[PDB]
């Protein structure tokens, strides 16, 4: 038993992190087979980033402007191209530690693990969720660009995020491994705001099930609610609506606890309208929305 | 920016996790050089764990009763011994993935990363704190024993925890890598209760320094206090007293903010006596006590 924010073991991704240098600027790159992937704003000077014409800057570089280091071994760049906001560097040796991998684009509300790196060296790993406004509340400092997010399915790594920038509110924005940003952001050095964020309702309910599996039940009630009447209150409180697909995905947790999904919705509806009265749920003073139903089942199956 | 519970990258430890089986009982082991470390109750049947005599059970075992597997690859046991509650198995292969490492016994309040493993397979990694009552609020299921806790300085892994037990209240108990339990627990399948827990004062202080560093400093006063007076008052509120070493590890944060340790103590003492008054500190209404001064330094500086 117990419930903790848990990330996937980072070892398979650690063996792929490298350092990429162009002139004065350095960031992290992902070395899979004989290709290194990194954010394209590595080819920018401090002045270029204000309003960069990337295709211009790229055509003015050659292979020898790129210094790639794996540990203390420099890799020779023999090719380069640009796919959206991601620069791809072909090297002359394949990574012997390349795992089975795929590039995926995740949906809002889904979670992934982030391996925060600096100068190609892993610093830490933590679990994130893609917000409905397509930001992530990560922990990134200068030089963390090129850090990747991922999930692991069996022994296959699904890369879903590469970090590019921070927003004035302190949240973070990035791309998939095809170089396409999540959300309406661009890799400029300009202040950019996201849309108003909402709470991931299906995740909150999954976390309420986790709280009950671990013995916390003070918030349960005996009101009932229809799916529509719950969604009416949810949207009023800036919560994402619950789909029937969301209801079905909560099924296993409903079966384990004997609490129908709509009864858990009634409990949550009361929490939104009443508050927590200074009480806590799994040691939290706030309703937590960065655990998916999959994340809860994986941790609580077998009570 | 951003503030999160962060685990160390687990790659160095993943390469040391193996599977140890005796009869039908399988748990996890730690493979460093040519020795495998695991909980000694692997030599127990389910009925044995009620009232085990461990050397009576151990002397009835020889090297060929132990199945050690790294993946599907078996490591032949060429020697065995018992050190406290940890079984050591000498194998005929030195782990080529052995990192630079160290065995340490941590103090209450110190944090570490846990690599949760099942059948020798890492499943997740999360951050933990040793509570004052010598339990950890972790997340463990059946077959998780032998999972280890660790810190990483430079490239040196400091192993500090190996998992043994779950208590009725859902918290967990284990030993250091020399087999000595943290707290007054024993590896027997009997009812054992953890003591009443307390708040880790040095970690709350570090978190107050983190708030000040980020411009959130309404809670500072002009009062000062003695170390003795603060400790006597803090125990009245279920807070741990500060040690000599606690003051010493708050030094860097004290120097960075220019706020003396005893002045921050006087600031926390008001917060305990007067409450929080519906105000916030780093976005929270709760004081956080599972971030050490090192966790704060390393996450507002990068590593
Ligand atoms: C990558 N190494 C780096 C990582 C971020 C820096 C600190 N935290 C991060 O997550 N990425 C960047 O520095 C990018 C580079 C662009 C995409 C070419 N820039 C920003 O993240 C950024 C842009 C603009 C502002 C800003 C501007 N005016 C006012 C304010 Cl309040 C903020 C901040 C950051």
XYZ file of C-alpha atoms and ligand atoms in Angstrom:
640
model
C 0.000 0.000 0.000
C 0.844 3.691 0.076
C 0.589 6.281 -2.674
C 3.430 8.403 -4.045
C 4.080 10.464 -7.136
C 6.113 7.942 -9.110
C 8.205 8.283 -12.248
C 9.451 5.558 -14.539
C 13.037 4.382 -13.985
C 15.186 6.727 -16.053
C 18.066 4.412 -16.940
C 17.134 3.677 -20.555
C 16.830 7.398 -21.275
C 20.022 8.289 -19.366
C 22.065 6.252 -21.857
C 20.790 8.489 -24.678
C 21.514 11.960 -23.259
C 24.312 13.955 -24.925
C 25.552 17.549 -24.959
C 25.190 19.723 -28.067
C 27.141 22.954 -28.563
C 26.843 25.565 -31.313
C 29.103 28.555 -30.772
C 28.323 30.015 -27.349
C 25.100 28.127 -26.501
C 24.924 24.593 -25.068
C 21.970 22.288 -24.394
C 20.973 18.629 -24.204
C 20.370 16.251 -27.089
C 18.806 12.817 -27.488
C 21.017 10.240 -29.232
C 19.011 7.407 -30.814
C 20.809 5.130 -33.269
C 22.921 7.493 -35.405
C 20.805 10.648 -34.938
C 20.921 13.327 -32.231
C 17.741 15.324 -31.569
C 17.818 18.709 -29.834
C 15.899 22.016 -29.832
C 16.666 24.114 -32.898
C 17.305 27.311 -30.946
C 20.785 25.903 -30.214
C 21.852 27.529 -33.507
C 20.916 30.959 -32.153
C 23.124 33.586 -30.598
C 21.711 35.636 -27.726
C 20.580 38.224 -30.287
C 19.050 35.749 -32.753
C 16.562 34.361 -30.218
C 14.596 37.634 -30.105
C 13.176 37.119 -33.624
C 14.997 34.152 -35.178
C 14.687 33.181 -38.835
C 15.694 29.573 -38.259
C 15.929 28.417 -41.881
C 18.238 31.387 -42.506
C 20.468 30.553 -39.532
C 20.575 26.853 -40.435
C 21.665 27.319 -44.057
C 24.601 29.387 -42.742
C 25.936 26.491 -40.636
C 27.843 23.371 -41.641
C 28.523 20.109 -39.825
C 31.637 21.416 -38.046
C 29.703 24.152 -36.191
C 28.112 21.420 -34.030
C 30.040 19.989 -31.073
C 28.381 16.840 -29.704
C 29.860 15.218 -26.596
C 28.905 11.846 -25.109
C 30.715 11.779 -21.795
C 34.241 12.818 -22.748
C 33.923 11.398 -26.289
C 33.144 13.857 -29.078
C 30.899 12.497 -31.833
C 31.497 13.564 -35.433
C 28.503 15.229 -37.085
C 28.147 14.171 -40.729
C 24.697 15.586 -41.485
C 22.004 17.918 -40.253
C 18.405 18.850 -41.030
C 15.532 20.602 -39.289
C 12.063 19.176 -38.623
C 9.824 21.940 -37.212
C 11.446 23.125 -33.935
C 13.792 20.105 -33.626
C 17.285 19.929 -35.119
C 18.446 16.455 -36.186
C 22.196 15.768 -36.261
C 23.491 12.647 -37.987
C 26.643 11.249 -36.372
C 29.103 8.592 -37.512
C 28.421 6.109 -34.690
C 25.158 4.544 -33.537
C 24.309 4.691 -29.833
C 24.932 1.162 -28.466
C 22.525 1.967 -25.613
C 19.603 2.841 -27.895
C 16.507 1.183 -26.402
C 13.412 0.109 -28.247
C 11.631 3.408 -28.726
C 8.846 5.274 -30.496
C 7.841 8.920 -30.873
C 4.310 9.681 -29.656
C 2.228 12.808 -29.113
C 0.265 12.650 -25.860
C -3.144 14.142 -25.048
C -3.923 16.665 -22.306
C -4.360 15.023 -18.929
C -1.898 12.232 -19.722
C 1.224 11.887 -17.586
C 4.877 11.232 -18.376
C 8.275 11.183 -16.681
C 10.803 13.974 -17.259
C 14.564 13.440 -17.089
C 15.966 16.884 -16.308
C 19.483 17.204 -17.733
C 22.178 19.873 -17.864
C 25.185 19.748 -20.205
C 24.091 16.269 -21.266
C 24.200 14.933 -17.692
C 21.001 13.740 -15.985
C 20.123 15.747 -12.884
C 16.791 14.334 -11.724
C 13.557 12.653 -12.753
C 9.989 13.606 -11.865
C 6.425 12.933 -13.013
C 4.487 15.540 -14.990
C 1.141 15.877 -16.720
C 0.250 17.700 -19.917
C -2.099 20.447 -18.779
C -5.340 21.163 -20.660
C -3.772 24.463 -21.765
C -0.790 22.475 -23.118
C 1.731 23.660 -20.536
C 3.512 21.569 -17.915
C 4.371 22.599 -14.356
C 7.931 21.315 -14.442
C 11.212 22.187 -12.749
C 13.650 23.522 -15.347
C 16.620 25.887 -15.114
C 19.002 27.444 -17.629
C 20.503 24.819 -19.908
C 17.706 22.286 -19.346
C 16.460 22.542 -22.944
C 16.626 19.220 -24.739
C 15.449 17.363 -21.648
C 12.847 14.810 -22.691
C 9.633 13.399 -21.295
C 8.703 9.755 -21.764
C 6.738 6.698 -20.742
C 7.912 3.082 -20.652
C 5.693 0.233 -21.875
C 7.345 -3.145 -21.212
C 10.860 -2.305 -22.443
C 9.815 0.276 -25.058
C 10.358 3.989 -24.414
C 7.703 6.317 -25.836
C 9.253 9.777 -26.114
C 6.553 12.445 -25.984
C 8.122 15.749 -24.893
C 11.233 17.838 -25.453
C 11.669 20.969 -23.350
C 12.134 24.375 -24.972
C 11.106 27.297 -22.776
C 9.571 28.796 -19.642
C 6.551 31.110 -19.495
C 6.280 34.229 -17.284
C 3.944 32.356 -14.911
C 6.696 29.786 -14.304
C 5.091 26.971 -16.316
C 6.868 25.315 -19.228
C 6.279 24.647 -22.920
C 7.820 22.248 -25.394
C 7.407 20.025 -28.418
C 6.947 16.407 -29.328
C 9.888 14.627 -30.928
C 8.647 15.741 -34.359
C 9.295 19.341 -33.282
C 5.666 20.480 -33.053
C 4.833 22.558 -29.989
C 2.131 21.492 -27.594
C -0.059 24.584 -27.485
C 0.066 27.995 -29.149
C 3.694 28.760 -28.285
C 6.729 29.581 -30.425
C 10.466 29.312 -29.771
C 11.055 33.046 -29.481
C 12.509 34.981 -26.562
C 9.208 36.776 -26.001
C 6.778 36.729 -23.094
C 3.974 34.302 -23.934
C 0.827 33.525 -21.961
C -1.129 30.288 -22.066
C -4.876 29.908 -22.096
C -6.659 29.687 -18.775
C -5.908 26.260 -17.361
C -8.519 23.785 -16.150
C -8.435 20.823 -13.781
C -8.232 17.282 -15.175
C -11.424 15.822 -13.706
C -10.849 12.155 -14.574
C -7.474 12.364 -12.818
C -8.991 13.919 -9.678
C -11.518 11.080 -9.468
C -8.788 8.471 -9.942
C -6.867 10.113 -7.093
C -9.998 10.084 -4.919
C -10.193 6.346 -5.567
C -6.537 6.065 -4.546
C -7.335 7.955 -1.341
C -10.117 5.485 -0.541
C -7.940 2.459 -1.371
C -5.458 3.823 1.192
C -8.139 4.412 3.842
C -9.052 8.095 3.427
C -12.851 8.234 3.184
C -14.021 11.367 5.034
C -15.114 13.028 1.769
C -17.519 10.245 0.742
C -21.244 10.974 0.842
C -24.505 9.376 -0.282
C -25.706 11.950 -2.762
C -25.988 10.654 -6.302
C -25.724 12.544 -9.579
C -26.240 12.077 -13.277
C -23.242 12.472 -15.563
C -24.698 15.685 -17.001
C -25.532 17.203 -13.608
C -21.959 16.538 -12.474
C -20.503 18.056 -15.646
C -22.638 21.171 -15.107
C -21.014 21.803 -11.721
C -17.586 20.759 -13.014
C -17.545 23.341 -15.817
C -18.761 25.954 -13.331
C -15.588 25.307 -11.304
C -13.229 25.248 -14.336
C -13.047 21.427 -14.329
C -12.861 19.519 -17.594
C -16.048 17.582 -18.413
C -16.181 13.843 -17.750
C -16.820 11.702 -20.815
C -18.424 8.272 -20.859
C -15.000 7.060 -21.998
C -13.584 8.569 -18.806
C -16.299 6.768 -16.830
C -15.431 3.434 -18.444
C -11.712 3.911 -17.780
C -12.466 4.414 -14.068
C -14.293 1.054 -14.013
C -11.519 -1.102 -12.515
C -11.064 1.351 -9.645
C -14.839 1.417 -9.171
C -14.886 -2.389 -9.027
C -11.993 -2.560 -6.549
C -13.619 -0.119 -4.112
C -17.308 -0.882 -4.642
C -18.000 2.821 -5.203
C -19.851 3.603 -8.426
C -18.187 6.271 -10.561
C -21.194 8.590 -10.289
C -21.151 8.251 -6.490
C -17.523 9.400 -6.534
C -18.679 12.265 -8.762
C -21.216 13.253 -6.095
C -18.408 13.294 -3.516
C -16.261 15.497 -5.756
C -19.203 17.807 -6.487
C -19.589 18.391 -2.750
C -15.861 19.101 -2.389
C -15.950 21.747 -5.126
C -18.927 23.499 -3.535
C -17.924 23.117 0.137
C -14.129 22.964 0.151
C -11.954 20.705 2.262
C -12.708 22.513 5.569
C -8.980 22.527 6.271
C -8.874 18.729 6.059
C -6.459 16.794 3.855
C -6.630 13.935 1.360
C -3.496 11.768 1.064
C -1.630 14.579 2.806
C -2.780 17.164 0.247
C -4.689 20.369 0.950
C -5.642 20.565 -2.747
C -7.397 18.199 -5.134
C -4.624 16.506 -7.122
C -5.073 16.052 -10.883
C -1.750 14.647 -12.149
C -2.479 10.953 -11.524
C -4.190 9.139 -14.384
C -6.447 6.122 -13.766
C -3.623 4.010 -15.198
C -1.164 5.548 -12.724
C -3.487 4.712 -9.818
C -4.210 1.139 -10.920
C -0.486 0.501 -11.423
C 0.181 1.542 -7.805
C -2.913 0.220 -5.998
C -3.778 -3.062 -7.751
C -3.973 -5.767 -5.109
C -4.777 -3.158 -2.404
C 11.887 27.724 -11.798
C 9.188 25.404 -10.504
C 9.257 23.297 -7.358
C 8.812 19.535 -7.317
C 9.698 16.397 -5.426
C 12.584 15.096 -7.520
C 14.228 11.696 -7.583
C 17.806 11.038 -8.561
C 18.310 9.427 -11.983
C 17.996 5.718 -11.263
C 20.182 4.287 -14.033
C 23.163 3.469 -11.820
C 20.937 1.548 -9.396
C 18.839 -0.180 -12.077
C 21.999 -1.908 -13.287
C 22.442 -3.453 -9.830
C 18.959 -4.905 -9.209
C 18.698 -8.706 -9.305
C 16.197 -11.357 -8.250
C 16.768 -13.702 -5.302
C 14.698 -16.855 -4.815
C 14.731 -19.460 -2.051
C 12.226 -22.259 -2.484
C 9.121 -20.382 -3.634
C 10.012 -17.035 -2.011
C 11.308 -14.394 -4.435
C 12.383 -10.828 -3.644
C 14.880 -8.262 -4.934
C 18.629 -8.117 -4.392
C 21.407 -5.571 -4.851
C 24.345 -6.750 -6.981
C 27.529 -4.762 -6.288
C 30.840 -6.164 -7.513
C 30.612 -9.893 -6.710
C 28.194 -9.732 -3.737
C 24.379 -9.713 -3.683
C 22.525 -8.127 -0.760
C 18.901 -8.891 0.071
C 16.582 -9.272 3.077
C 17.316 -12.413 5.082
C 13.654 -13.433 5.304
C 13.942 -14.742 1.727
C 14.907 -18.028 3.429
C 11.492 -18.092 5.124
C 8.315 -19.842 4.103
C 5.014 -18.089 4.790
C 4.540 -20.178 7.941
C 8.140 -19.538 9.048
C 7.715 -15.752 9.148
C 5.413 -15.989 12.190
C 8.181 -16.933 14.661
C 11.420 -17.426 12.719
C 14.780 -18.506 14.104
C 16.945 -17.132 11.330
C 20.209 -19.013 11.928
C 18.299 -22.230 12.610
C 16.828 -21.649 9.151
C 20.111 -20.430 7.650
C 22.324 -23.341 8.739
C 19.900 -25.655 6.904
C 20.762 -23.836 3.661
C 23.853 -24.028 1.462
C 25.055 -22.146 -1.611
C 23.059 -24.340 -4.007
C 19.687 -23.482 -2.399
C 19.855 -19.869 -3.643
C 18.582 -18.814 -7.079
C 20.069 -15.446 -8.080
C 18.980 -14.137 -11.484
C 19.850 -10.997 -13.450
C 17.125 -11.171 -16.062
C 16.928 -14.808 -17.101
C 20.689 -15.128 -16.484
C 21.540 -17.075 -13.325
C 24.439 -15.967 -11.125
C 25.979 -18.926 -9.308
C 26.221 -18.490 -5.545
C 29.679 -19.403 -4.231
C 29.249 -18.255 -0.626
C 26.751 -16.885 1.834
C 26.615 -15.176 5.221
C 24.163 -13.226 7.374
C 24.896 -9.694 8.613
C 22.028 -8.596 10.901
C 18.784 -8.710 8.845
C 20.599 -8.719 5.471
C 21.739 -11.847 3.626
C 24.954 -11.553 1.598
C 25.480 -13.923 -1.337
C 28.868 -14.150 -3.029
C 28.488 -14.839 -6.751
C 30.964 -15.890 -9.422
C 30.462 -12.754 -11.552
C 31.473 -9.191 -10.715
C 28.763 -6.788 -11.865
C 30.229 -4.811 -14.804
C 27.661 -2.079 -14.037
C 28.789 -1.573 -10.433
C 28.977 2.197 -9.833
C 31.160 3.959 -7.328
C 29.181 3.431 -4.157
C 28.998 3.729 -0.384
C 26.838 2.336 2.413
C 25.409 5.006 4.730
C 22.985 5.169 7.639
C 20.838 8.275 7.307
C 19.238 10.408 10.008
C 15.530 11.199 10.384
C 14.542 14.037 8.080
C 17.062 13.079 5.399
C 15.564 12.293 2.000
C 16.396 9.663 -0.606
C 15.129 8.107 -3.824
C 13.461 4.690 -3.840
C 13.686 2.353 -6.832
C 10.619 0.142 -6.446
C 11.384 -3.275 -7.924
C 9.371 -6.443 -8.520
C 11.015 -9.750 -9.457
C 14.264 -7.823 -9.874
C 12.605 -5.507 -12.410
C 12.535 -1.773 -11.628
C 8.970 -0.471 -11.838
C 9.194 3.096 -10.529
C 11.249 5.671 -8.660
C 10.050 8.197 -6.086
C 11.337 10.490 -3.346
C 11.088 9.624 0.348
C 11.969 11.045 3.749
C 12.975 9.113 6.844
C 10.325 10.149 9.358
C 11.194 10.924 12.994
C 9.501 7.651 14.023
C 11.879 5.773 11.672
C 9.248 4.811 9.110
C 8.895 5.982 5.521
C 5.611 6.946 3.861
C 6.331 4.948 0.724
C 4.510 2.903 -1.896
C 5.163 -0.845 -1.868
C 3.240 -3.930 -2.965
C 3.841 -7.658 -2.610
C 7.289 -8.744 -3.753
C 8.846 -5.298 -3.275
C 11.224 -6.310 -0.464
C 14.865 -5.686 -1.275
C 14.091 -2.436 -3.088
C 16.698 0.118 -2.088
C 16.855 3.803 -1.233
C 19.806 5.909 -2.268
C 21.369 9.292 -2.915
C 23.845 10.208 -5.659
C 26.677 12.670 -5.086
C 28.927 13.141 -8.117
C 28.787 9.653 -9.614
C 28.892 7.936 -6.200
C 25.736 6.117 -5.090
C 25.125 6.221 -1.337
C 22.814 3.320 -0.487
C 20.831 4.033 2.676
C 17.679 1.885 2.730
C 16.507 -1.619 1.857
C 12.814 -2.419 2.172
C 11.572 -5.109 4.567
C 8.108 -4.456 5.924
C 4.758 -2.691 5.882
C 3.143 -1.634 9.165
C -0.622 -1.643 9.890
C -0.911 2.126 9.345
C 0.396 1.772 5.781
C 3.924 3.090 6.379
C 7.057 1.042 5.754
C 10.136 -0.140 7.627
C 13.549 -1.414 6.632
C 17.276 -1.498 7.276
C 20.472 0.090 6.069
C 22.711 -1.959 3.788
C 24.461 -3.425 6.844
C 21.176 -5.014 7.918
C 20.395 -2.836 10.950
C 16.752 -1.762 11.102
C 15.827 1.882 11.286
C 13.743 2.121 14.443
C 12.719 -0.641 16.836
C 11.230 -3.013 14.261
C 11.994 -6.675 13.539
C 11.632 -8.895 10.461
C 8.848 -11.018 11.933
C 5.246 -11.344 10.751
C 3.788 -9.854 13.927
C 1.803 -6.747 14.812
C 4.215 -3.823 15.198
C 3.075 -0.217 15.573
C 5.079 2.851 14.625
C 5.422 5.593 17.207
C 3.608 8.889 16.911
C 5.249 10.943 14.187
C 6.480 14.536 14.368
C 7.259 17.290 11.884
C 10.832 17.592 10.603
C 11.768 21.094 11.756
C 14.993 21.504 9.771
C 13.126 20.723 6.545
C 10.340 23.226 7.252
C 13.055 25.833 7.846
C 14.741 24.975 4.540
C 11.350 25.368 2.847
C 10.923 28.777 4.509
C 14.330 29.780 3.135
C 13.225 28.579 -0.310
C 10.175 30.847 -0.071
C 12.347 33.839 0.855
C 14.699 33.137 -2.065
C 11.648 33.333 -4.354
C 10.492 36.687 -2.928
C 7.824 35.263 -0.579
C 8.858 36.689 2.786
C 5.831 38.139 4.617
C 6.425 35.731 7.524
C 9.754 37.246 8.608
C 9.766 39.190 11.874
C 12.237 41.228 13.916
C 12.337 38.672 16.743
C 15.207 36.341 17.571
C 15.377 33.309 19.832
C 17.871 30.965 21.414
C 18.361 27.450 20.093
C 17.346 26.030 23.482
C 14.186 28.139 23.778
C 13.126 27.238 20.234
C 13.611 23.498 20.810
C 11.557 23.570 24.017
C 8.714 25.421 22.291
C 8.907 23.326 19.108
C 8.302 20.074 21.002
C 5.034 21.570 22.271
C 3.831 21.624 18.634
C 4.963 18.100 17.607
C 8.111 19.477 15.925
C 11.547 17.904 16.196
C 14.272 19.761 18.096
C 17.155 21.129 16.066
C 20.568 19.521 16.367
C 24.022 21.045 16.069
C 24.247 19.486 12.613
C 20.837 20.909 11.663
C 21.993 24.489 12.245
C 25.152 23.687 10.292
C 23.362 22.424 7.165
C 21.079 25.477 7.126
C 24.195 27.656 6.788
C 24.277 27.962 2.985
C 20.610 28.993 2.836
C 21.248 31.360 5.753
C 24.170 32.936 3.887
C 22.256 33.185 0.605
C 19.357 35.079 2.191
C 21.272 36.945 4.891
C 18.789 35.620 7.464
C 20.287 34.060 10.577
C 19.174 30.546 11.479
C 17.883 31.683 14.875
C 15.933 34.503 13.198
C 14.232 32.037 10.846
C 13.550 29.894 13.922
C 11.888 32.863 15.613
C 9.905 33.285 12.384
C 8.708 29.668 12.465
C 7.871 29.975 16.169
C 5.422 32.800 15.421
C 3.851 30.751 12.620
C 3.252 27.928 15.103
C 1.929 30.158 17.895
C -0.154 32.477 15.684
C -1.057 30.114 12.848
C -1.088 30.869 9.144
C -4.095 33.267 9.067
C -5.397 31.962 5.742
C -2.162 33.100 4.081
C 0.123 31.238 1.690
C 3.802 30.279 1.514
C 5.072 29.106 -1.894
C 1.455 28.637 -2.935
C 0.639 26.252 -0.068
C -1.361 26.542 3.138
C 0.626 23.620 4.595
C 4.242 23.751 5.690
C 6.316 21.209 3.754
C 8.774 19.032 5.691
C 10.171 16.510 3.174
C 12.625 18.862 1.443
C 16.057 19.038 3.079
C 18.340 22.092 2.830
C 20.258 20.110 0.204
C 17.103 19.425 -1.817
C 16.359 23.160 -1.849
C 19.919 24.138 -2.793
C 20.241 21.539 -5.553
C 16.878 22.409 -7.151
C 17.399 26.199 -7.183
C 20.939 25.745 -8.553
C 20.904 22.690 -10.827
C 23.318 19.766 -10.680
C 16.839 25.933 -22.344
N 18.069 25.690 -22.111
C 16.007 27.088 -21.743
C 15.293 26.587 -20.475
C 14.358 27.612 -19.795
C 15.258 28.693 -19.184
C 14.955 28.755 -17.662
N 13.857 27.821 -17.439
C 13.512 27.171 -18.603
O 12.599 26.327 -18.642
N 15.125 27.709 -22.769
C 15.074 29.079 -23.110
O 15.828 29.850 -22.504
C 14.120 29.727 -24.192
C 14.825 30.051 -25.559
C 13.907 30.496 -26.746
C 12.798 29.459 -27.027
C 14.701 30.757 -28.035
N 13.484 30.952 -23.653
C 12.615 31.111 -22.548
O 12.318 30.118 -21.904
C 12.027 32.451 -22.092
C 11.582 33.442 -22.973
C 11.054 34.677 -22.534
C 10.924 35.040 -21.175
C 10.363 36.363 -20.658
C 10.397 37.577 -21.398
N 9.918 38.782 -20.992
C 9.342 38.899 -19.771
C 9.258 37.766 -18.957
Cl 8.507 37.963 -17.386
C 9.756 36.532 -19.392
C 11.386 34.030 -20.303
C 11.915 32.794 -20.733
